[PDB]
Design a protein around this ligand. Structure first.
Ligand SMILES: CO[C@H]1CC[C@H](n2c([C@@H]3CCCC(=O)N3c3ccc(F)c(F)c3)nc3cc(-c4c(C)noc4C)ccc32)CC1
Length: 126
């Protein structure tokens, strides 16, 4: 099987706005997770061809990753902060769907998710 194309990251037909919460999601939340020791597997779409995982995209139909999330933020793809938070959650739960619970990559995603939730609790008002 081929890989699917990556998720859309820009849509000129979607309205665009800057908000304090979206800026925080980019400049603090995403940046902190990006620099975490376990970030590398989550920095781009899963290359199931390279990883020899022919069933990945048979099981995962809503792929999401931090490279896509960051591009979405940079392209003003999200109107509401909750849309971005949803994509982070999708990334984590995809890992928990595809992989067996004791697997190293699941433990790594759990560590990233714990830090994510801490940073989301510091989201500013507005
Ligand atoms: C830019 O090149 C990429 C970097 C991440 C590489 N990678 C790796 C590399 C190569 C394969 C073996 C290995 O140990 N990897 C690795 C290497 C260094 C790390 F710091 C690390 F956390 C993992 N493992 C990946 C696992 C996943 C994954 C996700 C997310 N959900 O389910 C699975 C399976 C995704 C990517 C993985 C694949 C090539």
């Amino acid at each position: 099987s081929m890989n699917p194309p990556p998720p859309e990251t820009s849509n000129p037909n979607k309205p665009k706005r800057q908000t304090n919460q979206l800026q925080y999601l980019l400049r603090v939340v995403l940046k902190t997770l990006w620099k975490h020791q376990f970030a590398w597997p989550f920095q781009q779409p899963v290359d199931a061809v390279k990883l020899n995982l022919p069933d990945y995209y048979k099981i995962i139909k809503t792929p999401m990753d931090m490279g896509t999330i960051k591009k979405r933020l940079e392209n003003n793809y999200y109107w509401n902060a909750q849309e971005c938070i949803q994509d982070f959650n999708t990334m984590f739960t995809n890992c928990y769907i595809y992989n067996k619970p004791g697997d190293d990559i699941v433990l790594m995603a759990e560590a990233l998710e714990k830090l994510f939730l801490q940073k989301i609790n510091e989201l500013p008002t507005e």
